[PDB]
Design a protein around this ligand. Structure first.
Ligand SMILES: Cc1cn(-c2ccc(C(N)=O)c(N[C@H]3CC[C@H](O)CC3)c2)c2c1C(=O)CC(C)(C)C2
Length: 208
């Protein structure tokens, strides 16, 4: 059921750089995950214009931010296009390889870690605040999957048995013990207003 895969040497190096470099502006992780959600939502909305049946799995196009203090998790949920098994194992890793190389060169040339999203590898900014990342996803053409990694050179992929999603992606951030500020209502609201205020989809900040 659960399969284990090795990250490509370039992506393992990217993850080590994110985890090891001293960089206090960690809050940019949220903008990067919301932008990936917005790109996924644009994609399913565009596709539905020529094929309305692509919305049979859900008409609603939104982003939900869910903090859970008992679990120490921050979940970013979207009803976007979702990802297939091939996206999780091969496709996105191929894109991430060229993106990492360009990001690495720019950093040596004086660029900042906040600029990560310009190189299409913004997802890995999750490791600035999370010790473990779980990705639950459902694409129209494939089954529901759970991707997972605590870095260290490997990731796992398995068919997900949890609550069926219909269509979209859930990025669950298992926060580091010193990164619990991102579970606070005031902190999340302040970050969304600062970096993600003009997203073209409704963003609901859930409370506890
Ligand atoms: C790199 C890259 C981008 N992403 C990503 C994340 C969320 C979403 C999301 N919330 O949906 C996303 N969406 C894309 C999927 C492909 C499509 O063509 C555009 C939108 C992409 C990921 C990567 C990786 O190397 C690891 C990973 C687990 C496959 C996730």
């Amino acid at each position: 059921h659960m399969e284990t895969f090795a990250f490509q040497a370039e992506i393992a190096q990217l993850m080590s750089l994110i985890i090891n470099t001293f960089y206090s502006n960690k809050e940019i992780f949220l903008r990067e995950l919301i932008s990936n959600s917005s790109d996924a939502l644009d994609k399913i909305r565009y596709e539905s214009l020529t094929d309305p049946s692509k919305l049979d799995s859900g008409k609603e196009l939104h982003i939900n931010l869910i903090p859970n203090k008992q679990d120490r998790t921050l979940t970013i949920v979207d009803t976007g296009i979702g990802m297939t098994k091939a996206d999780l194992i091969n496709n996105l890793g191929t894109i991430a390889k060229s993106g990492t190389k360009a990001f690495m060169e720019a950093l040596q040339a004086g660029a900042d870690i906040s600029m990560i999203g310009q190189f299409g590898v913004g997802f890995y900014s999750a490791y600035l605040v999370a010790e473990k990342v779980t990705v639950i996803t459902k694409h129209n053409d494939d089954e529901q999957y759970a991707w997972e990694s605590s870095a260290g050179g490997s990731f796992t992929v398995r068919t997900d048995t949890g609550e069926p999603m219909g269509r979209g992606t859930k990025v669950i951030l298992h926060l580091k013990e010193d990164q619990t500020e991102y579970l606070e209502e005031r902190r999340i609201k302040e970050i969304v207003k600062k970096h993600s205020q003009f997203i073209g989809y409704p963003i609901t900040l859930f409370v506890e």
